[PDB]
Amino acid sequence: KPHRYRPGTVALREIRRYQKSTELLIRKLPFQRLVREIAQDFKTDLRFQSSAVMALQEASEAYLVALFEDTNLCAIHAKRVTIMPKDIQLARRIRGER
Amino acid sequence: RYRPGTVALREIRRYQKSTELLIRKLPFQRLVREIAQDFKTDLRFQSSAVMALQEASEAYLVALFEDTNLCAIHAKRVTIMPKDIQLARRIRGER
Amino acid sequence: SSGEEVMEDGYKGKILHFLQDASIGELTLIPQCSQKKAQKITELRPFNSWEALFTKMSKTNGLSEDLIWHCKTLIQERDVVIRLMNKCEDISNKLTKQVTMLTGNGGGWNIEQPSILNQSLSLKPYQKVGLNWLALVHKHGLNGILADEMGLGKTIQAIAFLAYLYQEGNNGPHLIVVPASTIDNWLREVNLWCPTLKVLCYYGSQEERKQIRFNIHSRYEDYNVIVTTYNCAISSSDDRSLFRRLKLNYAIFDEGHMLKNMGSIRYQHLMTINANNRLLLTGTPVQNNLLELMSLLNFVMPHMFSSSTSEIRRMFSSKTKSADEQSIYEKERIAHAKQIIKPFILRRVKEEVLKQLPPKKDRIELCAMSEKQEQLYLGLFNRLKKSEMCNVMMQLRKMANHPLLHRQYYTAEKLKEMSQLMLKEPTHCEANPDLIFEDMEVMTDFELHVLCKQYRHINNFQLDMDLILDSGKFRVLGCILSELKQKGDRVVLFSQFTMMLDILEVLLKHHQHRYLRLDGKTQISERIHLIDEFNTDMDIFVFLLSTKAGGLGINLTSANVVILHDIDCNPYNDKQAEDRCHRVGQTKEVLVIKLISQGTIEESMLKINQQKLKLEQDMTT
Amino acid sequence: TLLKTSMGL
Amino acid sequence: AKAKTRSSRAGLQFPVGRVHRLLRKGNYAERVGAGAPVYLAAVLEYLTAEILELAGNAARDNKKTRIIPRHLQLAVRNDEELNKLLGRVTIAQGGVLPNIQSVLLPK
Amino acid sequence: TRKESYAIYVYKVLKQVHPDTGISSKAMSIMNSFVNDVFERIAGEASRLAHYNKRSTITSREIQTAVRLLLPGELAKHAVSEGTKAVTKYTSA
Amino acid sequence: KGLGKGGAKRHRKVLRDNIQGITKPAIRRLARRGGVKRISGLIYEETRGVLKVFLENVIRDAVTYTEHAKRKTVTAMDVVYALKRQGRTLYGFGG
Amino acid sequence: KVLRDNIQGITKPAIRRLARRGGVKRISGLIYEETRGVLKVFLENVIRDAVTYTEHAKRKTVTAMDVVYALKRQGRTLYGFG
DNA sequence: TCGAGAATCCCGGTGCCGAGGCCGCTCAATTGGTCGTAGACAGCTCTAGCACCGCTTAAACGCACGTACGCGCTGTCCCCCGCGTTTTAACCGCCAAGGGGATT
DNA sequence: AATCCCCTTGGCGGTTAAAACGCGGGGGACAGCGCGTACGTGCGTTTAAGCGGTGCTAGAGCTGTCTACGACCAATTGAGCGGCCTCGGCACCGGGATTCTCGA
Ligand SMILES: Nc1ncnc2c1ncn2[C@@H]1O[C@H](COP(=O)(O)OP(=O)(O)O)[C@@H](O)[C@H]1O
Ligand code: BEF
Ligand SMILES: [Mg+2]
C-alpha cells in the first residue's frame, strides 16, 4: 500500500514553508514580459532598469499576499475553509479598492 | 400591525434622504467633553467644533454599518452581529 | 465679480461732509475704528479738498485707506434707511391724510358692531375705536401692532375684526397663534362672540395633529380660523409645510413679545408662514431695548425692511450705551423710530379710558430675614465674593427666598448614613451606596426632606415643622394671608421658582388654607378647568401661579390681592402678573403686594426694576 | 394722530 | 578657534548640519530655527536606536551575529507601536510572519 | 558622483546598541529608506504646522508637535523627552 | 447604581457615564441609515466602543493642534484639521 | 515586436504559492483568473504613475526611484530600493 | 496505544564573497560678521462660551407578545488535492550592439 | 550641442527544474429541515432634550515696538565618501538521529 498523505496536510506544510521563507514566489522572465506588455500600451519603446522590475515584483507580491490574507479572513467568516472569488470581491469592496 | 420590513425601507429611505443629525446634541457634547477632559483639563469648545465632530462621527458610523451589512450578507444572514463589525474593521485596518 | 470701485462724486461729497461734521461717537461708528484713527480726523481738519482729504489721511501715520471705504458703506447704509425714512413717513403721511377727512362729514367711516357678533354682547367705545383703526389700516394694505394695555380686550377686538372681514365677503383661512395656557380661552371666545366662524383647534400630539392634517387636506370640512400654539406651528417640518402651503390672509399673534428676539428659531420659523397680512397683539411692545422693538417692526412689516435688516440690527446694536452716551444721531434715530412706529402701533391705557375700574395700590414689604437665615446669607456671601460658579446671583437670591433652597441642615454625615441605610429598601437592595451619596450631594434640603417622607426606613430624618417655616418672607406672608382671609379676600400668589412653590404648598397646608396651583408641569388640557374652578368655587383661597405660565394671558377677575413672593429682574413679567387680576370686569380695588428681603440683592434688583420702569415711563410720553 | 381723529368721527 | 560639530555639542550621533541643510533645501519654510535640526536629529536617533535594538534581539534569536531584512521585518511587526508606525510599509525581502488560523489545523 | 546616506550614522548607533552585531547591505538600505521616510514625514507635518499658524519659521516647537502627532503612545513620550534633552544640552553649552 | 431615577424626582442629576448617552434608538437609526435591516442585541456595546475609540483618536489630534497654537478653546478648524489628518477630510467649514 | 498573452505567465502554481504564504489552506479553481485580473489592475495603475514621473523627468528609461515614488504616492511605501 | 516511512533537525566540514577597516581628498559644515524683519510681548476690545432657570413636548424606556430567523443536524455530490509522468521554457553563462543619460 | 561608455536589449545553447496533464478519492460546500429564542412592534409612562432668556467673564483676536534671531557671505578645515583590500559569517552538502503521520 503506497503511503498517501491525508488531503490537507501537505497544504499546511506548504503554508509553513512559504511563511518561513522570504524569496520571490513568481518567476522573473514571465513577470518582466508582463510589465513590458503593460508598459507598451501607455507609450512605445520604453526602457526598464532591472531594479524597476524587481521593485514592481516586490510590490505586487506584497499586495497579493495581503489580499489573500484578507480573502482567507472573509472565507473563515462564512464558515468555510475554501477561498472563492466572492471572498476576494468582498475583501476588495471592504478595503475600498473597488 | 404590519410586517417588519416595510418600516425598514421607509426609514432607510427617510434617513438616506435627510442630512440631519441622528444623535442628540447634548449627550454627544457631554461625551466629547468627557473624552477631552482626559487630555487637557479646563478646556473650552466652540459650538461649530462639536458640530463638526458629531457630523464626522455619524458619517463614520454609517460607513462602518454599510461594511458590516456587506459582511453579514456574506455569511448568508440578515442580522448584523459583532463579529461582522470586527471583521469590517479588521479588513479596513483599524485593528 | 471683483472690480475697481470708482468713488462717485455724490458719495465723495457725502463722505467729505460726514467726516467734516461727524462727532467723536459718530466717527467711532465707522468700521475699523482704532479710536486713535478717529481722533486723527479732528487733527486732520483742513478738509482742503477730497484729494487733499485723502492726502491728509494717508500722510497721518497709523491710518488705512479702507476707512474711506468703511464710511462709504456707513453713509450708504444710513442712506438706505433715509430713503426708507422717506418711504416710511409718506406711508405715515398717506395714512395721516385719510384719517383726517373722515372727521369732516357729519357721519364718517364708523364701522359699527357687526351683525355677526353676539347681539346680547356689545363692544365698548374704545374697542370700537380700535376696530375702526384696524379696518382702515387694513384698507391700505398694511400690518399693525395692537399694543393696548393688559386687559382692554385685544382678543375681543381681533375677533370682532375677523367677523367684520367675514361680513365683507372675506372667509379666507386666517390663523391665530397663541400661548399654550391661553388657547382654551381663545376657542371659548371666538364662539361666544362670533359663532359663525368655523374654528379648527390644530393642537395635540403628533398623532392627533397628523389626523387633523389628513382631514383638512381631505377637504373634509371648510375652516375659516385655525388656532394653534407657538410650538405646534413650528415643532415639525410637516406643520411648517402645512402652514406654508395653505393660503392664509391674517396671521394674528397673541403676546407678540415672544417674537422680541430676531435670532430665536421661532422667529424666522414664523416668517416662513405664507400670509397676506399679519397682526401682533401685545401689552408690552418695548421691554428693555429699542432693538427689540426694531425686531418686532421687522416682523410686522418685513418686505419694506427685509433686505435692510443688517443695517437696522447693527445701528440698533448699541445696547451698552447709557442715556447720555447715546450719540446725537442715536437720539435722532430714537425719536424718528417713534415717528416710524406711530402709524403701525396703537396703544390705549386703562387709567385713561376705563374710569370705572378701581385704581391699583402697592405694598413693598421689607422682610427682615431671621437670625439663622441672616447667618447663612452672610456666610454664603463671604464664600462667593472671593471667587465657572455662576452662583454669584442666582444662589444668592435663593438664600434671599428661603434657606431650604440649598443644603445646610443635611451634612454629609447624615447623607452617608441615609445612603447606607436605604439599602434596606426593596427598590434599592442592589443599589450602590457610594453612588447614592453622590446623588444625594446635589439634592437640596427640601428635596431630601421629601425623600425622607417618601421612604419608610428613613422616616426618622424629617425636618421639624418650625424649620421649614423659618423665613422672613414666610413670616410676613402668614400674617398677610390671615389678615386677608379675615377681610374676605382671595389671593393670587406668584413665585419664579418651582421649588419655592412646592414649599409654599407645605406652608399653606400648615395654615390649612385651600388652594390651587398652576405651573409649567400642569397639562395644557386642564389648565382652563383649573382657572374656571378658581373663578367659580369661592371656597378656594390661594391660587399658586408660576410666573412664566400662570402670568401670560389668563383671566383672574375673581381675586383682588396679588402677592409677588419674588419679583423679576425684568419688571414686565411682574406687570403682566399684576394685571392678570386688574382687567375688565374687576369689581374690587386690586392690591399688589411685593415681598422684599432686607439687606440683600433683592433691594438692588428692586432699584434696577424701578429704574427700568421709569425709563419706560419717560419713553412712552 | 389717528387715535385722535378716531373719536372725532 | 577649534571647530566642533553641532552634533557633538548636542550629544548626538546623527548629523545636525546635514539635517539642517535638508530642512533648508526642502522648501518646508522660509527660515529654519536653531533647535529644529537638533530636535529632528535627536528624534531620528531615538527611532533608529529602538528599531536597531529590536532587530538585534531578533537576529540573536536565530543564532546570527548580523542583521538582514527578515530580522527588521520581525522586529517591526512584533512590536505594537512600531507596527502602528510602519503599518503601511513594505519591507523588501522581509517576508511574512508565521501565523495560521485556528480552524485550518486538522480536527 | 557623490551620494549621501546615513550608513555610517546607523552603523555607529548599532555599535552603541549591540557592540557585537553587524548589519548587511540590504538591511542598511532599508534603514536608510526608513530614516528618509521619517524625516520627510516629520518635516512635512512641521511645515504644515507652520503654515497653519501663519508662521514662516520651523522651530523646535513645530518639530515637537509633529513628533507628538505622528509617533503613537510611548514612542512620542520618549522621543519628546530625548529631543528636549538634546536641545537643552545644545543650548546649555 | 444610584437612586434609581424613576420615583426619585431630582432637580439636577450627577450626569456620569455619558457613553450611554448614545442611546440604542440612535444606534438603530444609524444602522438603518446604513442599510441594515435587522440588528443583534450585542451591537450596541460594540458600537459604543467603536465610537469612543474614533472620538479619542480625533480629539487627541484636535487638542494637540490647539495646544500648539497657545489657545484654550478647540476651534472648528482644529477639528477639520484633525479629521483631514485621518484621511477623512470634511467639507462644510473649509478644506 | 509584439508582446502578448504573458498575463498567463503568472502561473497557477505561483498563485498557489502566493496563497500559501498568505495562509490559505484550500483554493477554489476560479481564484486564478480573479487573481490575474487583480494583479493586472494593480500593475497598470502603478505603471501609469511611474511613466508619468518618467515623462515629467523627460527620460526614456523608467528607474526604481520612479516606481518607489509612484508606490509612495499610493500609500504603499516600499523600503529597500531608495 | 503502536512500527514504518517520510520529512526535519543537528553537527561537522568548505569555501567564497561581501562586511568592515584603512587611506587620500574634496567640499560641505563651522566660525565670525553684519543686516533686516519675524515674532515675543504688552496692552486692549469685545465676543462668545458657559452657568443657571423655566416650559413644553417628543423621544426614550419598560414590558408584553409573537413569529421570523439563526443555528444544529443530515445527506449528497462534486470539486480540489496528493501523487505520478511528461514537456518546456526559465535560467545561466557567454557575447555583441547600440543608444541614452551624463559630462565636456 | 558633441561625445562616451555603461547598461540594457537582444542572441545561442543546454539542462534540468518546474509546470502541465491525468486520475482516484475524500472531504467539504450546499441545500434542506426543525426547533426555539431573540428581535421587532405596540402601548403607556416619564424623562430629558431643546429653546428662550438673563448675565458674566475668560480668552480670542488685533495692533504696535523693538530685540533677537536667522539669512547671507567669506574663509578655513576636517568629516565623510569613494576606493581598495582582507578575512570570517554564512550558504551549502552530507551523514546520523529525531520527530511526525498513518494505517494496521
Ligand atoms: N367687550 C367686552 N365686554 C365685557 N367684558 C370684556 C370685553 N372684552 C374683554 N372683556 C373681559 O376681559 C377679559 C378678556 O381680556 P383679554 O382680551 O384677554 O385681555 P388682553 O387684551 O390683555 O388679552 C374677559 O374675561 C372679559 O371678561
Ligand atoms: F393681554 Be390680556 F390683557 F392678558
Ligand atoms: Mg390675551
3-class SS string, C278-346 = EEEECCCCCCCCHHHHHHHHHHHCHHHHCCCHHHHHHHCCCCCCCCCCCCHHHHHHHHHHHHHHCCCEE
Give residue G13's Cα distance to chain centre: 21
CB-CB neighbours of H52 under 10 Å: 15
Classified as helix, coil or strand, H18 is: helix
Q: CB of C131 closer than 6 A to ligand 1?
A: no
Nearest partner of F62 among E23, G72, E15, E12, judged by Cα? E23
Cβ within 8 Å of residue C212, ≥6 positions away: C200, C202, C204
DSSP string, chain F: -----SHHHHHHHHHHH-TT----HHHHHHHHHHHHHHHHHHHHHHHHHHHHTT--EE-HHHHHHHHHHHS-THHHHHHHHHHHHHHHHHHH-
Report which residue type is found at H72. K
For strand I, is any atom closer than 7 Å to the CB of C499?
A: yes
Report which residue type is found at C403. P
Whether the Cβ atoms of residue H38 and residue A64 lie closer than 8 Å to each other: yes
* Separation between Cα atoms, residue B71 and residue B81, nearest integer Å: 10
Classified as helix, coil or strand, E87 is: coil
Cell of G84: 483631514
Classified as helix, coil or strand, C120 is: coil
For strand I, is any atom closer than 7 Å to the CB of C546?
A: yes
* Separation between Cα atoms, residue E91 and residue A58, nearest integer Å: 9
Cβ within 8 Å of residue F17, ≥6 positions away: E49, E52, E53, E56
Terminal alpha carbon distance of chain A = 51
* Separation between Cα atoms, residue G49 and residue G56, nearest integer Å: 11
Report which residue type is found at C290. L
Whether the Cβ atoms of residue A57 and residue A27 lie closer than 8 Å to each other: no
* Separation between Cα atoms, residue F43 and residue F84, nearest integer Å: 17
DSSP element (H, E) containing H78? strand H77-79
Taking each helix axis from N to C terminus, what angle separates A28-42 and A50-77, rounded to the nearest 10 degrees? 100
Handedness of CA E30, E32, E36, E38 (dihedral sign): positive
Whether the Cβ atoms of residue E80 and residue F41 lie closer than 8 Å to each other: no
Q: Which residue of G has its CA nearest to B26?
A: G21
Whether the Cβ atoms of residue C373 and residue C470 lie closer than 8 Å to each other: yes
* Separation between Cα atoms, residue G17 and residue C547, nearest integer Å: 35
Residue with cell 457610594: C434
* Separation between Cα atoms, residue C298 and residue C291, nearest integer Å: 10
Cβ within 8 Å of residue C37, ≥6 positions away: C62, C63, C64, C67
* Separation between Cα atoms, residue E39 and residue B12, nearest integer Å: 53
Cell of A62: 506584497
Report which residue type is found at E6. R
* Residue E87: exposure state from Cβ atoms within 10 A (0-12, 13-18, ≥19): exposed
Residues surrounding ion ligand 3 at CB below 5 Å? C 553
Chain breaks in chain B (C to N over 2.5 A) after: none
DSSP string, E13-63: SS-SHHHHHHHHHTTS-SEE-SSHHHHHHHHHHHHHHHHHHHHHHHHHHTT
Whether the Cβ atoms of residue A93 and residue B70 lie closer than 8 Å to each other: yes
Rounded to the nearest 5 degrees, what angle is found at the Cα of C130, between the Cα atoms of C128 and C134?
Answer: 115
3-class SS string, C414-477 = HHHHHHHHHHHCHHHCCCCHHHHHHHHHCCCHHHHHHHHHHCCCCHHHCCCHHHHCCCHHHHHH
From the CA of C32, how many Å to the C1' of J59?
A: 21
Cell of C425: 429598601
Flag if G11 and C443 touch (Cβ within 8 Å). Answer: yes
**What is each CA distance from G3 to C422, C443, C448, C457, C498, in whole angstroms?**
10, 11, 12, 15, 22
Cell of C583: 382687567
For chain B, the structural domain boundaries read 1-95
Whether the Cβ atoms of residue C15 and residue C71 lie closer than 8 Å to each other: yes
Give residue G38's Cα distance to chain centre: 23
Whether the Cβ atoms of residue H79 and residue E89 lie closer than 8 Å to each other: yes
Resolution in A: 3.1
Residue with cell 406672608: C477
**What is each CA distance from E100 to A21, A67, A84, B63, E96, in whole angstroms?**
15, 15, 19, 30, 11
Asked if E104 has any chain H CB less than 8 Å from its own CB, the reply is yes
Cα of E99 to nearest chain F Cα, Å? 23
DSSP element (H, E) containing C569? none
Cell of C137: 389700516
Whether the Cβ atoms of residue C589 and residue C360 lie closer than 8 Å to each other: yes
Cα of H55 to nearest chain A Cα, Å? 10
Whether the Cβ atoms of residue H23 and residue A77 lie closer than 8 Å to each other: no
Domain that holds residue F62: 1-92
Classified as helix, coil or strand, E94 is: coil
Whether the Cβ atoms of residue C504 and residue C495 lie closer than 8 Å to each other: yes
Antiparallel, parallel or unpaired: β C515-518 and C542-546: parallel
Flag if C451 and G8 touch (Cβ within 8 Å). Answer: yes
Q: Which residue of G has its CA nearest to B44?
A: G73
Give residue C459's Cα distance to chain centre: 44
**What is each CA distance from C587 to C357, C377, C440, C556, C581, in whole angstroms?**
7, 42, 50, 12, 10
Whether the Cβ atoms of residue B58 and residue G29 lie closer than 8 Å to each other: no
Cell of E28: 518646508
Flag if C432 and G9 touch (Cβ within 8 Å). Answer: no
- Reported for C411-417, long-range contacts at CB under 8 A and 24+ positions apart, including other chains, are C412/C437, C412/C441, C414/C461, C415/C440, C415/C441, C415/C448
Phi/psi-derived region of residue C344, left when phi > 0, alpha when psi is between -120 and 50, beta in every other case: alpha
- Is C404 annotated in a binding site? The answer is no
Supply φ then ψ for residue F39, to 5 degrees. -60, -50
**What is each CA distance from C252 to C199, C209, C227, C230, E15, in whole angstroms?**
14, 20, 10, 12, 80
Nearest partner of B33 among B25, B44, B24, B23, judged by Cα? B44
Report which residue type is found at C422. M
Cα of H64 to nearest chain E Cα, Å? 13
CATH number, domain A3-98: 1.10.20.10
CB-CB neighbours of C504 under 10 Å: 23
Helix intervals (H) in C102-205? 125-139, 154-167, 183-193
**Which ligand 2 atom is the nearest neighbour of the CA of C281?**
1
Whether the Cβ atoms of residue E78 and residue E58 lie closer than 8 Å to each other: yes
Nearest partner of A62 among B94, H74, E79, judged by Cα? H74
Phi/psi-derived region of residue C462, left when phi > 0, alpha when psi is between -120 and 50, beta in every other case: beta
From the CA of E63, how many Å to the C1' of J87?
A: 21
* Separation between Cα atoms, residue C111 and residue C109, nearest integer Å: 6
Q: CB of C554 closer than 6 A to ligand 1?
A: no
Cell of C4: 475697481
* Separation between Cα atoms, residue C288 and residue C570, nearest integer Å: 8
Domains and CATH numbers, chain E: 5-90 (1.10.20.10)
Residue with cell 512641521: F46
Task: Give strand pairing partners of C594.
Answer: C364, C564
Residue with cell 465707522: C30
* Separation between Cα atoms, residue B91 and residue A2, nearest integer Å: 43
* Separation between Cα atoms, residue C239 and residue C235, nearest integer Å: 7
Q: CB of C490 closer than 6 A to ligand 2?
A: no
Asked if H76 has any chain E CB less than 8 Å from its own CB, the reply is yes
CB-CB neighbours of C161 under 10 Å: 24
CB-CB neighbours of G12 under 10 Å: 9
Nearest partner of G66 among G57, G54, G76, judged by Cα? G76
For strand I, is any atom closer than 7 Å to the CB of C393?
A: no
CB-CB neighbours of C163 under 10 Å: 22
Whether the Cβ atoms of residue C553 and residue C182 lie closer than 8 Å to each other: yes
Q: Domain count for chain F, please give it.
A: 1
Flag if B64 and G62 touch (Cβ within 8 Å). Answer: no
Report which residue type is found at A52. A
- Is C355 annotated in a binding site? The answer is no
* Separation between Cα atoms, residue C461 and residue B53, nearest integer Å: 47
DSSP element (H, E) containing A47? strand A47-48
Supply φ then ψ for residue C126, to 5 degrees. -70, -35
Cell of F21: 552585531
Domains and CATH numbers, chain H: 1-82 (1.10.20.10)
What chains are in contact with A, requiring at least 3 Cβ pairs below 8 Å?
Answer: B, E, H
- Reported for C337-342, long-range contacts at CB under 8 A and 24+ positions apart, including other chains, are C337/C290, C337/C293, C337/C294, C339/C89, C339/C92, C340/C85, C340/C88, C340/C89, C340/C92, C340/C297, C341/C145, C341/C293, C341/C297, C342/C92
Nearest partner of C19 among C7, C29, C9, C8, judged by Cα? C29
Task: Give strand pairing partners of C252.
Answer: C176, C279
Taking each helix axis from N to C terminus, what angle separates E69-78 and F25-52, rounded to the nearest 10 degrees? 50
* Separation between Cα atoms, residue H43 and residue C57, nearest integer Å: 67
Cβ within 8 Å of residue E41, ≥6 positions away: E7, E10, E12, E14, E15, E16, E19, F86
Classified as helix, coil or strand, G71 is: coil
Terminal alpha carbon distance of chain G = 45
Whether the Cβ atoms of residue C471 and residue C370 lie closer than 8 Å to each other: yes
CB-CB neighbours of F42 under 10 Å: 23
Domains and CATH numbers, chain C: 9-81 (no CATH), 109-353 (3.40.50.10810), 363-369+469-619 (3.40.50.300), 410-462 (no CATH)
Supply φ then ψ for residue A59, to 5 degrees. -65, -45
DSSP element (H, E) containing H36? helix H31-56
Rounded to the nearest 5 degrees, what angle is found at the Cα of H77, between the Cα atoms of H72 and H81?
Answer: 100
Class of domain B1-95: mainly alpha
From the CA of H5, how many Å to the C1' of I92?
A: 25
* Separation between Cα atoms, residue C229 and residue C231, nearest integer Å: 6
* Separation between Cα atoms, residue E47 and residue E12, nearest integer Å: 13
* Separation between Cα atoms, residue B36 and residue B44, nearest integer Å: 10
Cβ within 8 Å of residue B5, ≥6 positions away: G37
CB-CB neighbours of C59 under 10 Å: 9
Nearest partner of A53 among F41, H6, F7, H23, judged by Cα? H6
Length of chain G as a residue count: 95
Report which residue type is found at C471. S
Flag if F34 and H82 touch (Cβ within 8 Å). Answer: no
Cell of G77: 478648524
DSSP element (H, E) containing G85? helix G76-85
**Which ligand 1 atom is the nearest neighbour of the CA of C127?**
1
From the CA of E92, how many Å to the C1' of J14?
A: 33
Handedness of CA A82, A84, A88, A90 (dihedral sign): negative
Task: Give strand pairing partners of C546.
Answer: C495
Instruction: Classify residue C177 by its DSSP letter.
Output: E
Phi/psi-derived region of residue C455, left when phi > 0, alpha when psi is between -120 and 50, beta in every other case: beta
Supply φ then ψ for residue C46, to 5 degrees. -60, -40
Cell of C140: 391700505
Q: Where are the beta strands (DSSP E) in chain B?
A: 44-45, 79-80
CB-CB neighbours of C121 under 10 Å: 10
The CATH number of residue F45's host domain is 1.10.20.10
In the reported structure, the alpha carbon of residue C613 is separated from the centroid of ligand 1 by a whole-number distance in angstroms of 25
**What is each CA distance from C137 to C141, C173, C293, C345, E65, in whole angstroms?**
7, 20, 20, 11, 102
Supply φ then ψ for residue C247, to 5 degrees. -105, 110
Q: Which residue of F has its CA nearest to H68?
A: F33
Rounded to the nearest 5 degrees, what angle is found at the Cα of C378, between the Cα atoms of C373 and C384?
Answer: 120
Whether the Cβ atoms of residue B69 and residue A55 lie closer than 8 Å to each other: no
Whether the Cβ atoms of residue C404 and residue C434 lie closer than 8 Å to each other: no
Handedness of CA F29, F31, F33, F39 (dihedral sign): negative
DSSP element (H, E) containing H43? helix H31-56
Q: For chain C, what is the radius of gyration of the CA atoms?
A: 30
